[PDB]
């Protein structure tokens, strides 16, 4: 009864794991990435977040009403996290050829990490909601 949930048709789960993987990709290849490629890894993280927000949006009407507002808040937290990452990416671009380059990239990594952690929190929230839905039914 404490076994992992069946993820076969679980779109939210798929998109959360894709987002975490995209963050891992950014983290892995940021050190060797040329300045013009900063927008590419960040847009890709953002693209995966867009799908996650979409998949949660579709699910929300079928989750218990008491679950929806906290899940909505976590969606807005992910948006705030992405805004922060974009900000750090811009700073990294502005300071490509200055002595602030390494610090800006360090802050990009930190912002991207926070986004992935908050994505996992959304997954937990959605999983809880689905369990509580099965209780009401």
């Amino acid at each position: 009864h404490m076994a992992n949930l069946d993820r076969t048709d679980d779109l939210v789960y798929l998109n959360v794991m894709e987002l975490v993987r995209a963050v891992l990709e950014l983290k892995n290849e940021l050190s060797q990435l040329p300045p013009e490629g900063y927008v590419v890894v960040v847009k890709n993280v953002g693209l995966t977040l867009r799908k996650l927000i979409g998949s949660v949006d579709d699910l929300l009407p079928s989750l218990p009403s008491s679950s929806r507002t906290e899940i909505e808040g976590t969606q807005k937290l992910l948006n705030k996290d992405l805004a922060e990452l974009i900000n750090k990416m811009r700073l990294a671009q502005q300071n490509a050829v200055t002595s602030l380059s390494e610090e800006a990239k360090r802050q990009m990594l930190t912002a991207s990490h926070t986004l992935a952690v908050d994505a996992k929190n959304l997954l937990d929230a959605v999983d809880q909601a689905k369990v509580l839905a099965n209780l009401a039914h």
């Binding site: 847009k43 867009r50 948006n79 992405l82």
Partner: peptide
């Protein structure tokens, strides 16, 4: 369109 989705599309617009 939900508020979260609109807010995000505004962010992705700043990248494109």
């Amino acid at each position: 369109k939900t508020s979260a989705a609109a807010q995000l599309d505004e962010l992705m617009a700043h990248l494109t």
